[PDB]
Amino acid sequence: NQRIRIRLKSFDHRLIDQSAQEIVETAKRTGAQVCGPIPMPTRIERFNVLTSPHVNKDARDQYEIRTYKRLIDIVQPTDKTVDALMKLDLAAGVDVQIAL
Template identity: 45%
Template sequence: MKKTTVKKTDVAKLRIRVRAYEHKILDASVRQIMDTAARFDATVQGPVPLPTEIRKYTVNRGAFVHKNAREQFEMRAHKRLVDIVNPSGKLVEALTNLSLPSGVNIEVKML
């Protein structure tokens, strides 16, 4: 059997990871990013929901004797992933000038 090799063309990708504690704010922010990319006719892959990061903290309710009386708190971090294929310079500039609500963390990587 003959193996065929296919060369991949170098495609620039802008990978955006969005993270927030409230999923409604997160979805609104991702929608803003998608609308901005659609205005510049960019090819968008996503949004891909990533696993929710759950941190649980257990504390004692009582001070001394009441070991079995405990209370649990948790923090949930929701995450989404958006890929933009072959972003133009104007699109990158528009994304940097985008004002998103507080509580939304964004990581941008160029692949």
């Protein structure tokens, strides 16, 4: 019943999807059964920034930053699974959390 739960967070959805696909392929190569990746709801933060140095209240730039989240479940892990997942390299811009 040793289930490995992997949570991925990123600011770039292409990066997060590539990382999730690589993780899933790495697990399937070893031969475990995997569930996902499952896309969690995205967080969107918005900001209103004045563009003029002194006085133009209606002249603003609107920015946003999104946080994408993926969930992966690994069940019936082979002994090689944990070692391969730990040996997997850390891609920049993606945060990976593993819970046993």
